[model samples]
Target: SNQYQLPLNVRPYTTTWCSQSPSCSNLLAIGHDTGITIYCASEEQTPGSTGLTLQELFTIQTGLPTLHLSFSSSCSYSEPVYSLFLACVCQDNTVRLIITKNETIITQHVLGGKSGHHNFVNDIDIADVYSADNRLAEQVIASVGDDCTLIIWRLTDEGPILAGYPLSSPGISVQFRPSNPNQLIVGERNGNIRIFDWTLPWLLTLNTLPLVNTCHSSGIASSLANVRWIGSDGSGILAMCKSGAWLRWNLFGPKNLLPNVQGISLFPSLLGACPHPRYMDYFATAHSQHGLIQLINTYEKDSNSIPIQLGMPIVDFCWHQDGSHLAIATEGSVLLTRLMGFT
Candidate 1:
């Protein structure tokens, strides 16, 4: 019952991860610990004040720890199919690939290594499982570093390689399981949530996880923050955590323990979670000290509903494939909000 509104002026600057490009316009793609910024939204303001009126087209320096940001839309006959595919993930480790048009930089890819939590490059997911005439045949980006590695990149035709099994665990956050985009659900700092099947090589199938009373209180102190995968239309799959809690499962047929779940609010302890993509049931959590951004809703509720505070502290939130617009990322600032009705 706390819904305030006053956004649309994304002129400031900060970063960690912010992405958009599902046609919700007003452009936005920021991720920094060192580099990456692209904001555009300015129809001049005033009429409503925050329909976002930003400006800052491009920047890329990168050192990793750029937290996470992903954008990909491949299909061209001439252009304008909403072209912009960028991926930045740095924690001192690497991964920065860009492809812009008038603002320049048509191709760039620098992928290196260092893991066991070697320090940075923590999350980013982009998948297109291959089928329809192979759909031009190249698209798959999954990076998770800090040494707890989990890499998958294959943009073929003799270019971006590194495909097949390479799924390392101990993740900080690595998603790609909206129902099952080849499966991937990793979130660990100890609280646990690992589900990887990078085409199954069998280092892990679906490790046991059912001890998350988290703060549901039974006096176990507390533990749980980092679990992202909010959206799956294949008929089941929607997850979100990082303390702000949120869940939903039904991996359809042979489950491995992902029961009807639910959660909302109360992860304001360390913060970091971005769930809205297909809206399996809403998602947004980022509050690491006072940067509170809570746009909650953890549907599937058999019992667990209490969270409706979109005040904006933002750490990371993305959606724009007809979910309107919500691409927020903050540490310094990177914003894009216009979800009055996705289109």
Candidate 2:
């Protein structure tokens, strides 16, 4: 079957979809040569079409070219307004925030001023959580850059401001625990995966987390690309190394780190693991030479594996929050395909 492809002049560095329901429909954002473009997923009239179309909503070309972007949303005071925001790591050693309400861009802010990192920002993760009163709480953001520093920022009424001193160590991946807002998982170049408890006391001094609980990957000296929570409760973690090796860790188990769970030789080079947002037992990884995306169903270990053939090499891919749609980026275009995994 033919999938929907958005042709572009510049190659896409990264792409992300906002799961939040909007007036038009779901939203997807893509970062490329000089700016990030936002699109609304809607249905339009077209002969022999796929029954779906992506209409351009807006774009911000800051001339600083984006490397990575993360989406988060918050509700308004009285109305059901969803304040959608995207934070991108620019090539110029800074971060930019694009805020939108409904389908309009409201404001944008660039972080990492005089107090910011001196090198290029590599990744960004926003803590999106809600309170009992349906209010947005803990508007915290974390970013890792080439400066060997991890900085935390608080999104306030004015804008996102630097909240603490930059932590040391060059971090390639940083992720906030989905269930526990204060707990964070950071993967560094030294192949170390450290979890930090961001309680009030620890935030004051900005001290490092407990080193005793940290675990090293099988590729102890390789830089990591992604570190993600496996399940909802945050019990398991999956980390991907730059050398195409990955590891799984059980936080509460006696032997915390399980090295090379997915035989290192299976995939020559691994792009990343796109775990289903809700399903801990399944995820996807792209191979280097073959350009194949293999769906790994942890629940059925003996099940035969079938790889999705994209023909062209994949630069990046992401699973929709619902795990039904996947956006894949190739040389100079993005393809959207329906995911029909096991029932």
Candidate 3:
């Protein structure tokens, strides 16, 4: 009774936690070949039980298939007049931004051409904090593509404008530092996970000299599949390669290098991390081979895997902003699970 199935037969490529606060914790956004589905997750009417169900509210058709999609807030928690925005990377080498209010799209913008990606856009991320210039980092969105280009954009009232020159690399995944919005964590196909710091003009501080350029050489000789900042202030990072090799590195102190720290092997490639917003040390990983999800606690170096099994492998998943629920996407549909005890 807690589970809900999508009406469409299409596969879900990505799913994002769309609820902005605890009050809206039951909402989620799922991306598929035809378009996106935004639905509500309301708890069942019962006592002393834990069960939630989904009800589709609306759908938007984009025609093109989607590779990835993410949500962002225009203003920080400290700011006034905040708005929710959704960005989608499609198979047509274009990106779409949809501005929504009360779960309804108000305006939409399609970005393409030379300023956009020339190849398949691999990923897109929106910064939720502000930059050094006191502008909301959500105003600036970043995208990486197979064309080896990294483009940054600044969202304005008019539309999105280029923030800086396109970076050249075999880019795979890109993420902005939650603690420091000016810094970035970029994973490349050459097996290098590089960190860069940008200035006001939107240029790298060291001109290609990354503050930390790490690579796993011995095992799993493949490009990085995903890279993320794990600790507060970006003190640690978690990375996974295309060959199912994963590792967590301490950015400072004696064991700062990859070989110096113990690396772990997973059953499949790690796609994403759903870190707790307030508890930075806690996060979850979605696996590809076994359709598993593992919850990790950095403080104790302990982990727990969810036993729920599905027919298809997991594509991606995300944690609610309040860290109370999870939205998991597989090839065919999406699942919503509410966490218990570990608040």
Candidate 4:
């Protein structure tokens, strides 16, 4: 009748910051305003007091206020790569890259210098996409921050490939296209959606349609607090707006451009949104008010929106590599939620 919250040993911080974990297994990663902690699923005889059971396996210092954290199955695991990647950049000008194996630190990269714009970095995404070779090449990571700069870094053998664009406005959210892995979508602080080609080093622009004031649409378009590309499974590019609206556009159609007109959802205002790893029809959205998560099906012809609470207001959410569960990060810590959908 009642769902109990598991106890996580998160102490030593005056303020609770951001936390997240992998969806498929028993792994958890926690971030404070100043540090980070990693937890693994407990292979114990009895589960924790809560339905979930995981414990801290290791801890590391991010050097800044690290808010966004994620895991890539392609990069750091053993056979399937079981490593975790954490990004911390809000109050600091640097982007710290960390690689962990079985909760242990393996390799790391500190990306920032003349290349990093703005003093703070807020969000990051390592695409779960592969090239035509099917060999699973070096992953691509994108970061957005206060200076309105979007940087794309390719983790590779030679070193990481770096590209930067000073946007017309600041960006809080950035993501890569799932279907067309070479395409990238960015949500600007000004509330406009910017898409770019991965094959080239150029800034994506609107040549035909005039760029309108993003504020007119979301009341805070210029302040697009957060951005994410959703439903790439034939549903087009969907982005969450600060004004509490969901906008959709066909980024790769006959026109090859998102028009001035876009599809708008009147659902509750969202704080964050992420597409499922495997399901084209599924996505998880978090709200700012109650901090709830809604897992919805976008394939229905009619409107049947089902909302599922993930226990907190998720600052960021993502699907595990196996496409079986979701990893969510709130202002406090990270938690794993299994997607009990019918196969």
Per-residue error for 108 in candidate 2, Å, reads 1.8
Candidates ranked by TM-score, best first? 2, 3, 4, 1
Error of 2 at 223 (Å): 3.3
Quote the positional error of residue 333 for candidate 1 in Å.
8.4
Write down the worst ten-residue block by lDDT for model 2.
203-212
Best by TM-score: 2
**Which pairs of residues have clashing backbones in candidate 3?**
none
lDDT values for all models: 0.52, 0.63, 0.63, 0.54
What lDDT tens digits, residue by residue, belong to model 3 across residues 272-330? 45566556666676666677776666554555545345556887878766566667777
lDDT string, candidate 2, 1-343, tens digits = 2344544566678877764332322667778776776665554554333344556666656566677877765422226454567778877677777776654668877776667776767678876655667666557778876677777877755555565434456777778876687788766655556677754523211111222123433443445656787777787777665554555554553543323244332453446677777777667777745667777665456254644676778877787665666777676766766655431
Candidate 2 Cα lDDT to native: 0.63
Total clashes, candidate 2? 0
Model 2: residues with Cα > 4 Å off, grouped in runs: 5-7, 20-25, 42-58, 75-83, 101-104, 129-134, 157-161, 164-168, 201-221, 251-262, 268-270, 288-290, 299-306
TM-scores for all candidates: the values are 0.31, 0.78, 0.77, 0.68
RMSD of each: 17.2, 5.5, 5.2, 6.0
Q: lDDT ranking from best to worst?
A: 3, 2, 4, 1
lDDT of 3: 0.63
Which scores higher on TM-score, 1 or 3? Answer: 3
